[PDB]
């Protein structure tokens, strides 16, 4: 605001869970604000999300970025997270943002699974959200769950197990049962305001076809395929994601 | 079981919320079990649900019935309940039931909004649930939310308010935004095992057309229209609901 600029820690609650977040506060009495959503197994402080927040703050766009339930510093077991309860987390964060008297326009920025959360939340609040940026939005998590193959971990899609060992973690069977029937595009398509879609051509985690499909469903979208970029826009690809996001929101 | 028959209190947790429930335990080493779901603003102990549980227990069918979040003895604010987080409550109760070593078949019985919870949960677990009974399933809550008229309380469906005073309570705007885009029939229709639909012809809360539509979408359903019955199968209508439910599950 006019008096404080910088980082602050924010905590919110959703159901019985504390959600821990970082606010970047820019200069100015009134400013726009982006809510930034991390991906599956990630956290609010990956290099990509910090550099997005930093870049927006440099153009006097505020941001908040929270750890989802089951991730980072927020409460809850990873095994109990689903895309649906992350959308509930997102709604709780939006409640916080939308009542801040400094905030003019609200934007959503989501990476990967956080892009599915962002796109679905904007479709539930198409009257309130003003712009959306999706970075490698993981809408393919649905098709993967229907196929019975989630990032190389295979199971019966017709009879999903109670829980699925997944790397060092345990993924809930309910995550997968929800994933299979998530109306990702149906809900997302209700947002008719501007959307920026950014996807790396060498993403091996989420096919760029996800973003090509969002670009088809959305009334007002712009698609950016980043030649050679991977799923996280790592290293020399990162500024492609940061620049496009910043430019779109200013 | 062979040694204890009667009532017990059960508590489960979902996210950070305690859910309080009543188990009716029948005689027998192995038995089927019904999970019974109450409606909007109701609780696990309405006369209808107690008499269902009692009648099933008399045919040695066990049951559990929990207060949803925001209701009865369970945790959470009513203002923060949605149909979606009740489905999350239902999944937590199913986790409990499906790991009980006495339970043979699992049935779902849901009244009104609890019927939407039941029908959607069965569509997420069509491999596990064996039979469903819906009593006046409130699938019209979706159409009502799209219309902007929820049990006589009117609002703009295009711009749902943050919260909606509703009788002595406060209904969350997010309940309504979720309601509008709930894929009730899409998810429910995935359950192809037997369903019993029971609806009163004089229900003024949820049109009998809801049950007529479920009867169309389901592969294996039986529809019972109870001439003169109201929304709760009150008083002299109650045994119609209790008898049909019991008969169907035995
Ligand atoms: C951390 C950033 O990346 C992620 O969010 C990717 C998520 C996503 C991809 C495909 C899947 O089948 C899936 O199922 C769990 C998840
Ligand atoms: C207690 C048993 O009855 C209920 O569950 C009925 C619920 C239902 C009916 C129509 C609605 O528009 C609605 O929106 C909140 C809720
Ligand atoms: Cl100020
Ligand atoms: Cl000043
Ligand atoms: Cl700082
Ligand atoms: Cl705080
Ligand atoms: Cl606490
Ligand atoms: Cl400005
Ligand atoms: Cl930094
Ligand atoms: Cl840092
Ligand atoms: Cl972490
Ligand atoms: Cl945690
Ligand atoms: Cl697709
Ligand atoms: Cl299994
Ligand atoms: Cl949904
Ligand atoms: Cl689809
Ligand atoms: Cl469709
Ligand atoms: Cl969207
Ligand atoms: Cl490509
Ligand atoms: Cl990853
Ligand atoms: Cl960068
Ligand atoms: Cl026993
Ligand atoms: Cl004995
Ligand atoms: Cl007793
Ligand atoms: Cl207990
Ligand atoms: Cl507690
Ligand atoms: Cl038996
Ligand atoms: Cl009693
Ligand atoms: Cl009693
Ligand atoms: Cl009560
Ligand atoms: Cl309560
Ligand atoms: Cl309908
Ligand atoms: Cl309003
Ligand atoms: Cl419909
Ligand atoms: Cl459809
Ligand atoms: Cl169903
Ligand atoms: Cl009728
Ligand atoms: Cl009522
Ligand atoms: Cl009775
Ligand atoms: Na500072
Ligand atoms: Na800070
Ligand atoms: Na603090
Ligand atoms: Na709370
Ligand atoms: Na808390
Ligand atoms: Na600043
Ligand atoms: Na200013
Ligand atoms: Na990440
Ligand atoms: Na972790
Ligand atoms: Na933690
Ligand atoms: Na925490
Ligand atoms: Na969790
Ligand atoms: Na925890
Ligand atoms: Na866990
Ligand atoms: Na403006
Ligand atoms: Na797909
Ligand atoms: Na899909
Ligand atoms: Na399929
Ligand atoms: Na498979
Ligand atoms: Na992968
Ligand atoms: Na595997
Ligand atoms: Na399954
Ligand atoms: Na497993
Ligand atoms: Na399915
Ligand atoms: Na669906
Ligand atoms: Na769903
Ligand atoms: Na979809
Ligand atoms: Na753009
Ligand atoms: Na990659
Ligand atoms: Na893949
Ligand atoms: Na395209
Ligand atoms: Na293209
Ligand atoms: Na488009
Ligand atoms: Na344009
Ligand atoms: Na393009
Ligand atoms: Na294009
Ligand atoms: Na372009
Ligand atoms: Na490029
Ligand atoms: Na490359
Ligand atoms: Na690189
Ligand atoms: Na940068
Ligand atoms: Na630069
Ligand atoms: Na007893
Ligand atoms: Na008891
Ligand atoms: Na006890
Ligand atoms: Na828990
Ligand atoms: Na608790
Ligand atoms: Na008994
Ligand atoms: Na026995
Ligand atoms: Na009731
Ligand atoms: Na109450
Ligand atoms: Na209470
Ligand atoms: Na409680
Ligand atoms: Na609640
Ligand atoms: Na409480
Ligand atoms: Na309340
Ligand atoms: Na059997
Ligand atoms: Na309707
Ligand atoms: Na409908
Ligand atoms: Na409509
Ligand atoms: Na209206
Ligand atoms: Na009414
Ligand atoms: Na009114
Ligand atoms: Na609305
Ligand atoms: Na209001
Ligand atoms: Na809509
Ligand atoms: Na939908
Ligand atoms: Na939804
Ligand atoms: Na529907
Ligand atoms: Na029947
Ligand atoms: Na009635
Ligand atoms: Na009505
Ligand atoms: Na019919
Ligand atoms: Na009929
Ligand atoms: Na049928
Ligand atoms: Na038959
Ligand atoms: Na009939
Ligand atoms: Na019929
Ligand atoms: Na009949
Ligand atoms: Na009748
Ligand atoms: Na009557
Ligand atoms: Na009567
Ligand atoms: Na009776
Ligand atoms: Na009798």
Domains in chain A: ranges and CATH = 1-250 (3.40.50.1820)
As a whole number of angstroms, the distance between CA B245 and CA B198 comes to 8
Taking CA–CA distances from A179, the nearest residue in chain B reads: B124
Q: What is the DSSP string of A31-84?
A: EEEEEEE--TT--TT-HHHHHHHHHHHHTT-EEEEEPPTTSTTSSS-GGG--HH
Which of B212, B121, B174 minimizes the C-alpha distance to A91? B174
- SS3 for A242? helix
Which two structure tokens, joined as six digits, stand for A97?
A: 């943002």
In this structure, the residues whose C-beta lies within 6 A of any atom of ligand 2 are: B 39-42, 111-113, 138, 140-141, 144, 150-151, 205-206
List of residues 6+ apart from A231 with CB closer than 8 A: A112, A136, A200, A203, A204, A205, A206
Count, residues in chain B: 250
> Atom 11, ligand 2: which residue's CA is nearest?
B141
Question: If you ran DSSP here, which 8-state letter would residue B90 be given?
Answer: H
Q: Find the helix or strand (DSSP H, E) in which A223 lies.
A: strand A221-226
Beta-bridge mates of residue B108: B35, B132
Which two structure tokens, joined as six digits, stand for A78?
A: 């990873």
List of residues 6+ apart from A207 with CB closer than 8 A: A140
As a whole number of angstroms, the distance between CA A11 and CA A13 comes to 7
Q: Find the helix or strand (DSSP H, E) in which A107 lies.
A: strand A103-111
For the CA atoms of B88, B92, B98, B100, the dihedral, rounded to the nearest 10 degrees, stands at: -160
Quote the Cα angle for B109-B112-B115, to 5°. 40
Chain A residues whose CB is inside 8 A of the B181 CB are 123-124, 183, 186-187, 190
Q: Given an 8 Å threshold on Cβ–Cβ distance, is A158 in contact with B127? A: yes
As a whole number of angstroms, the distance between CA B168 and CA B166 comes to 6
As a whole number of angstroms, the distance between CA A207 and CA A137 comes to 9
- Residues B84, B180: contact at Cβ < 8 Å? no
Chain A residues whose CB is inside 8 A of the B16 CB are 15-17, 75-76
List of residues 6+ apart from B94 with CB closer than 8 A: B35, B106, B121, B125, B128
- Residues A166, A152: contact at Cβ < 8 Å? no
> Atom 14, ligand 1: which residue's CA is nearest?
A141
Q: Find the helix or strand (DSSP H, E) in which B226 lies.
A: strand B221-226
Which of B200, B241, B20 minimizes the C-alpha distance to B109? B241
List of residues 6+ apart from B10 with CB closer than 8 A: B20, B21, B22, B23, B64, B66, B96
Dihedral angle sign, alpha carbons of residues B90, B91, B95, B101 = positive
Residue corresponding to tokens 């996800």: A210
- Residues B196, B167: contact at Cβ < 8 Å? no
Spacing, Cα A18 to ligand 16 middle (Å): 32
Chain A residues whose CB is inside 8 A of the B186 CB are 181, 183
As a whole number of angstroms, the distance between CA B210 and CA B138 comes to 7
Which of A13, A58, A56, A8 minimizes the C-alpha distance to A35? A56
Interface mutation vs chain A, best among B14, B15, B163, B189, most A CBs within 10 Å: B15
Residue corresponding to tokens 């077991």: A77
Spacing, Cα B184 to ligand 34 middle (Å): 7
Burial class (CB in 10 A: 0-12, 13-18, 19+), B20: middle
Q: b/e map of A179-201 (b: 16 or more CB within 10 Å)?
A: bbbbbbbebbbbbebbbbbbbbe
Q: Given an 8 Å threshold on Cβ–Cβ distance, is B17 in contact with A14? A: no
Which two structure tokens, joined as six digits, stand for A41?
A: 């197994």
Residue A178 contacts B where some CB pair is shorter than 8 Å: yes
- Residues A118, A39: contact at Cβ < 8 Å? no
Q: Find the helix or strand (DSSP H, E) in which B15 lies.
A: none
Residue B80 contacts A where some CB pair is shorter than 8 Å: yes
What share of residues in chain B are helix, strand, coil (percent, to 5)?
35, 30, 35
Q: What is the DSSP string of A74-99?
A: SSS-GGG--HHHHHHHHHHHHHHHHT
As a whole number of angstroms, the distance between CA A187 and CA A208 comes to 20
Residue A17 contacts B where some CB pair is shorter than 8 Å: yes
Residue B243 contacts A where some CB pair is shorter than 8 Å: no
As a whole number of angstroms, the distance between CA B135 and CA B39 comes to 10
- Residues A160, A173: contact at Cβ < 8 Å? yes
Q: Given an 8 Å threshold on Cβ–Cβ distance, is B85 in contact with A88? A: yes
User: In chain A, which ranges are continuous DSSP H helix?
Assistant: 47-58, 83-98, 113-124, 140-147, 173-180, 184-188, 209-217, 238-249
As a whole number of angstroms, the distance between CA B121 and CA A178 comes to 10
As a whole number of angstroms, the distance between CA A208 and CA A200 comes to 7
As a whole number of angstroms, the distance between CA B38 and CA B22 comes to 12
Chain A residues whose CB is inside 8 A of the B17 CB are 15-16
- SS3 for B8? strand
Q: What is the CA radius of gyration of chain B?
A: 17
As a whole number of angstroms, the distance between CA B53 and CA A139 comes to 42
**Chain B, 89-118: which have a CB under 8 Å from a chain A CB?**
91, 95, 98
Question: If you ran DSSP here, which 8-state letter would residue A136 be given?
Answer: S
Residue A212: phi and psi, rounded to 5, are: -65, -40
How many helices (H) and strands (E) would you count in chain B? 8, 12
Count, residues in chain A: 250
As a whole number of angstroms, the distance between CA B200 and CA A11 comes to 47
């Amino acid at each position: 605001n006019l008096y404080f600029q910088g980082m602050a820690t924010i905590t919110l609650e959703r159901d019985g869970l504390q959600l821990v977040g970082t606010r970047e506060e820019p200069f100015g009495e009134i400013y726009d604000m982006a809510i930034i959503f991390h991906g599956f197994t990630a956290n609010r402080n990956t290099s990509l999300l910090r550099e997005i927040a930093n870049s927006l703050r440099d153009e006097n766009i505020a941001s908040v970025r929270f750890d989802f339930n089951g991730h980072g510093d927020s409460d809850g077991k990873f095994e109990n997270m689903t895309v649906l309860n992350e959308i509930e987390d997102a709604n709780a964060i939006l409640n916080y943002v939308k009542t801040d008297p400094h905030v003019r326009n609200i934007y959503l920025v989501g990476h990967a699974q956080g892009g599915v959360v962002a796109s679905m939340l904007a479709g539930l609040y198409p009257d309130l959200i003003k712009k959306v940026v999706l970075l490698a939005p993981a809408a393919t998590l649905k098709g993967d769950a229907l196929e019975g193959n989630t990032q190389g971990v295979t199971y019966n899609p017709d009879h999903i197990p109670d829980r699925l060992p997944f790397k060092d973690l345990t993924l809930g069977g309910f995550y997968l049962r929800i994933a299979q029937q998530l109306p990702i595009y149906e809900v997302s398509a209700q947002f008719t305001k501007p959307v920026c879609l950014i996807h790396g051509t060498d993403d091996t985690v989420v096919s760029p076809n996800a973003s090509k499909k969002y670009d088809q469903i959305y009334q007002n979208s712009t698609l950016h395929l980043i030649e050679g970029a991977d799923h996280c826009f790592s290293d020399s690809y990162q500024k492609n994601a940061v620049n496009l996001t910043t430019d779109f929101l200013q």
